[PDB]
Amino acid sequence: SVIKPEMKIKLRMEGAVNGHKFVIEGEGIGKPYEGTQTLDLTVEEGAPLPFSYDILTPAFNRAFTKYPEDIPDYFKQAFPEGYSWERSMTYEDQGICIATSDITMEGDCFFYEIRFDGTNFPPNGPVMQKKTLKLIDATEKMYVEDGVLKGDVEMALLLEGGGHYRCDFKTTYKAKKDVRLPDAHEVDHRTEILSHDKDYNKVRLYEHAEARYSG
DSSP, X not given: OOSOSSEEEEEEEXXXXXXXXXXXXXXXXXXXXXXXXXXXEEEEESOSOOSOGGGTTTTOOTTSSBOOTTSOOHHXXXXXXXXXXXXXXXXXXXXXXXXEEEEXXXXXXXXXXXXXXXXXXXXXXXXXXXXXXXXXXXXXXXXXXXXXXXXEEEEEEEXXXXXXXXXXEEXXXXXXXXXXXXXXXXXXXXXXXXXXXXXXXXXXXXXXXXXXXXX
16 A cells, blocks of 8 residues: 555656657656556756657556556555566667666655667658657557566557557566566556647656456
């Protein structure tokens, strides 16, 4: 019960995409048992970002997932100690990203240390030309492997003009203590930028996520 019905968020992301270094910090609040959250993000170094903000938004905590009582909740069980995650993202035009997050908590607040790196995006492709509109709603397949929880998803970004820009996500989630390991299940995601300033130096970001068995 260290996870309260309403939890604050504080984060710092550092990284580089196609040679461009940047730092983004964030603060927000969400409802862990309802699987909802809102974050306000600020570019602190590297403004204005020259690449699509939509390659960043899944990097900005599965503790914010509505878990049914008959699926063990790997993420909420891990606290107060917390957990980390490691993620590969391979895009269809051979741009590739790696991201990690170390997630701790103090009081009623989660803290994230995020690293995000991306490279080999075509200079005239949709990421470097900021032609993405949003993340399409996606289902993440969760399963235990090597004693930890994995998540795989074949997701797409929507492009200006209606095209789909595909990315294969693979995440490894590592609790900092032993927890009850769930059977295979799925997490449905909806991700939305609610508002932003001109160059996305300021961004308000929303996620809704819920766990369920397939079928």
